[PDB]
Structures are given as structure tokens and as C-alpha cells.
Design a protein around this ligand. Structure first.
Ligand code: BQN
Length: 182
């Protein structure tokens, strides 16, 4: 019944300042819409390294997406997606950071490029994983296919490709049409 959701967002060199900002604003829009629900949130920036920008405990105490992401600094390096997903699985989904042990775990990965690392995501198998690929780096079918290995199956449900960062607004509009009292 409880949902612990992690935004895992790309901070690579390829992102223009306005594009990075549009990611931040998308995340804030989602959190504001799902205030006072069974959702609790954490946000992790990934590039070459990984940083928990705020954790679940932070969200519970402040419930203020604007304040929680206010100190985010764009890393401007690579795109270590494998390492990032593993970091979330092992280092973020923990009591110490306010994760609830019996909650449904969800990961929202937001990226504008292919992974610069390798390996596996076995550690994250118990997490429902969605991935949003954004921009000109994902023009080809082949490039989009590379993201499937990070998301839950089927790709038709868990993988979304956006032409531009402006389309995050459209995605947020679409998302809200899927909100229900169950
Ligand atoms: O809380 C959630 C999920 C929330 C969620 C899901 C996706 C996404 S993005 C996404 C990324 C890839 C593909 C589509 C996507 O969204 C469109 C969509 C969603 C659901 C149904 N139809 C269209 C998002 C996003 F955060 F907006 F990115 C969420 C949530 F907002 F809730 F956190 N769930 C579903 C799994 O079981 C627990 C409840």
C-alpha cells in the first residue's frame, strides 16, 4: 500500500542548463500532485558519481519539493546508469534514509544518453523500474532499445522516449490522467 519512489536523474555534461532545470521541475510537479498520499520520495542525481539530493526522511519532515531540490548542483560528467541503479538499490532503499521496509519500491530513471558503464542490475530486481529517455540522443530505435535493460518489462509500459525536454510538461499532463482513488 505504501510506495517509496526514487527519482534517479541524469546530470551528464550533455544536458544544457535549461534541460537539467526542466527535469528538476518535472520531479517537483509530480511530488506536489502526490502530496499527502501513501507516496514518499527520494531524489538521486547521477553522472559519473551518485548523490542523494534528499531522502525519504527529508521528504516526510519538510514535504516541500522546492526546498528539497534547492541545493542541487549539475554534475556535468558521464552517465553511469548501471552504477546509479545499483547505488539506489543498495544505498537509498534503506531505513537509515527513511525507506519503509514493506513498501512497494518504485524507481523513475530520467536520462538523455546511453550508459557509459557496464554490468548488471540484479540488485534492483525487487524494484518496479520506469525509464524516461529524452532528446536527440534517442532518435534511433537502437538507442531506445538500449534503455529496456534498465526498466521493468514490458518496455511498452515502463519505457518512455521524449523528443524534447519541453515534452516533460506533456508527460505530466498524461500522468495526471492516470491518477485514481482506488
Ligand atoms: O506509482 C506508480 C507509478 C508512477 C509513475 C509511473 C511512471 C512515471 S513516468 C513514465 C515512465 C515510463 C512510462 C510511462 C510513464 O508515465 C506515463 C504513464 C504512467 C502510468 C500509466 N500510463 C502512463 C511517473 C512519473 F513520475 F511521472 F515520471 C510515475 C509517478 F509520477 F507516479 F511517479 N505506480 C505504478 C506501479 O505500482 C505502484 C504505483
Amino acid at each position: 500500500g505504501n510506495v517509496d519512489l526514487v527519482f534517479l536523474f541524469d546530470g551528464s555534461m550533455s544536458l544544457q542548463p535549461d534541460e537539467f532545470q526542466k527535469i528538476l521541475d518535472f520531479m517537483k510537479d509530480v511530488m506536489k500532485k502526490l502530496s499527502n498520499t501513501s507516496y514518499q520520495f527520494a531524489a538521486v542525481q547521477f553522472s559519473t558519481s551518485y548523490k542523494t539530493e534528499f531522502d525519504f526522511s527529508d521528504y516526510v519532515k519538510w514535504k516541500d519539493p522546492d526546498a528539497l531540490l534547492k541545493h542541487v548542483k549539475h554534475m556535468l560528467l558521464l552517465t553511469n546508469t548501471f552504477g546509479a541503479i545499483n547505488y539506489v538499490a543498495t544505498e537509498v532503499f534503506r531505513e537509515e534514509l527513511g525507506a519503509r521496509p514493506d513498501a512497494t519500491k518504485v524507481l523513475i530513471i530520467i536520462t538523455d544518453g546511453e550508459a557509459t558503464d557496464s554490468g548488471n542490475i540484479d540488485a534492483a530486481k525487487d524494484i518496479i523500474r520506469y525509464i524516461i529517455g529524452i532528446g536527440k540522443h534517442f532518435q534511433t530505435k537502437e538507442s531506445q532499445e538500449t534503455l529496456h535493460k534498465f526498466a521493468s518489462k514490458p518496455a511498452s509500459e515502463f519505457v518512455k522516449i521524449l523528443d524534447t525536454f519541453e515534452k516533460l510538461k506533456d508527460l505530466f499532463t498524461e500522468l495526471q490522467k492516470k491518477i485514481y482513488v482506488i
